[PDB]
Ligand binder design. Structure first.
Ligand SMILES: CNC(=O)CN1Cc2ccc(Cl)cc2[C@@]2(CC(=O)N(c3cncc4ccccc34)C2=O)C1
Ligand SMILES: CNC(=O)CN1Cc2ccc(Cl)cc2[C@@]2(CC(=O)N(c3cncc4ccccc34)C2=O)C1
Ligand SMILES: [Cl-]
Lengths: 305, 298
């Protein structure tokens, strides 16, 4: 019993964190095999950030301008290339702690663990979701650039995010491990703002099924809804549209609890209309949207209470 | 910017998790040097009567794919210590520490000696923890990391009928009035950790949330008379002193913030949130707030 925002054990990722320095800029890098991946803005000054020409800044650099520190050992850079917004530094030593890994690009609504690092040293781990507006509500200070997001499955680490910047609203933007940004953001200090954020509907539904599994049904009602009527109501509360794919994905949770997806949608509609009336759901007074259907199945018991 | 329930990096603890099996019972053990520590209920009660009927070969200890050989066994309170023939090469620098209610720690939840998740939690004033544990989680450990030294403070034993959790320090002494056996056990009425709610209100002010601040102050006694009515733990002079740094960083006196908390208890939040929450959060200590708003690494 219980329901917590659970992160993956971070050990496999801790053994990959290194410190990368170029001139006066210092940030984190991910050391996998003989390559260190880090944000390309390590080659920038603060002035350069307004309109940086990364190709012009990179061509003026040699291998020995990049200082890479792994623990107390200095790694030697023997090559460098840029791939989108990520710099790839070829080093002379393969990481003996390299786990089994994949680079995966995630979609909005998907969750992942973040290992927040400063000076190549991990400081904390937390769980978060890729918001529909492609930002993440993380906890990052200056020097956290290069910190990574990941999931773990059967000892294979799937790297999905690398931290690049904080937007004026305090939210965070970054790239996949191929250097392609999530969202319409650029690694430029330009007037860019996150789009209006929305609630991840399929995740709120999954969390309502998690509450049922753990023994709570106060919020259920005798009504059902059509998918279209649910979406017309949900859009009014800034909730993301629920698609047939979402309904299909909620199938296992519907079978484990005996509650049809459109019946759970009718309960969500009523919760949006009435609020919680001094009651909580899994220890929360707000409708939680950072647990996916997969996360609920992973954390919760296979036997409903 | 941002404020999250952050756990310590779990790597140093992952390298200590093993699976312990005795008869039909399987649970998690902590392998430090040549000793595996695990809950004594693995032998299940008259524990030193069940223990004398066991030999070393009855305990199967599995570290990854390797089988460790047990060469000795002894009991310390509710914890069983299994002497093994191999010292853990991944043993970190460590201490066993007993924490007090209100203190927080990271939990590495394991099943069959394999870590599955890490989360942060607090020791409640009623000595229980609101964790997320399923059957097979026994022996999962709680810890804090301070300068590459891991301080082990909790070992999971059981779940109470309300869904909350109970366990011991690493010396086998239970937190709370509990026993390791199937009997009528219930957690006492819980209270809110006041010094932690105040620390989290300071974290909100640091993060640019100030709607709840007011021009008023209060005495410590008047605050405690009000707080006692909402099932909040009494705030002591020690708590005020501990909040001193946060009071100086934000310019808001502790008793000045106590007057904001009093108004929040008496009026609610009025449809507003604080750090994305509609409830007053009490699982961040003053030290957790300072650490997360500073950048301390391990
Ligand atoms: C909030 N941003 C700024 O004050 C200026 N920043 C412009 C800028 C523009 C583009 C890019 Cl790709 C990087 C960056 C910087 C580089 C950097 O370290 N960050 C940060 C990252 N995460 C969290 C932070 C929290 C506080 C202060 C800085 C943070 C940035 O956003 C710097
Ligand atoms: C609720 N538990 C029971 O019905 C039986 N339990 C007797 C028992 C008696 C003494 C001791 Cl010290 C432990 C235990 C068990 C062993 C064990 O793994 N647990 C559990 C731990 N965490 C979370 C759990 C979630 C669901 C079911 C069991 C959980 C127990 O409490 C099992
Ligand atoms: Cl995805």
């Amino acid at each position: 019993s219980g329901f917590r925002k659970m992160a993956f054990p971070s050990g496999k990722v801790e053994g990959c964190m290194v410190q990368v320095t170029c001139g006066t800029t210092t940030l984190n890098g991910l050391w996998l095999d003989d390559v260190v991946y880090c944000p390309r803005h390590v080659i920038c000054t603060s002035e350069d950030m307004l309109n940086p020409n990364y190709e012009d800044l990179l061509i003026r650099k040699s291998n020995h301008n990049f200082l890479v520190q792994a623990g107390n050992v200095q790694l030697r850079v023997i090559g460098h290339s840029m791939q989108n917004c990520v710099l790839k530094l070829k080093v002379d030593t393969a990481n003996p702690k390299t786990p089994k890994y994949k680079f995966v690009r995630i979609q909005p609504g998907q969750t992942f663990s973040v290992l927040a690092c400063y000076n190549g040293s991990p400081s904390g781990v937390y769980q978060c979701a890729m918001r529909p507006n492609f930002t993440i509500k993380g906890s990052f200070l200056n020097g956290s650039c290069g910190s990574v997001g990941f999931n773990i499955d059967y000892d294979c680490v799937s790297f999905c995010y690398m931290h690049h910047m904080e937007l004026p609203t305090g939210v965070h933007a970054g790239t996949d491990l191929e250097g392609n940004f999530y969202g319409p953001f650029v690694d430029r200090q330009t007037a860019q703002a996150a789009g209006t954020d929305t609630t991840i509907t399929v995740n709120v539904l999954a969390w309502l099924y998690a509450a049922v599994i753990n023994g709570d049904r106060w919020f259920l009602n005798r009504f059902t809804t059509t998918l279209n009527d649910f979406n017309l109501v949900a859009m009014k509360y800034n909730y993301e549209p629920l698609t047939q794919d979402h309904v299909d994905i909620l199938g296992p949770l519907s079978a484990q609890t005996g509650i049809a997806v459109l019946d759970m949608c009718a309960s969500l509609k009523e919760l949006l209309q009435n609020g919680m009336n001094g009651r909580t759901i899994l220890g929360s007074a707000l409708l939680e949207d950072e647990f996916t259907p997969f996360d609920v199945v992973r954390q919760c018991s296979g036997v409903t209470f």
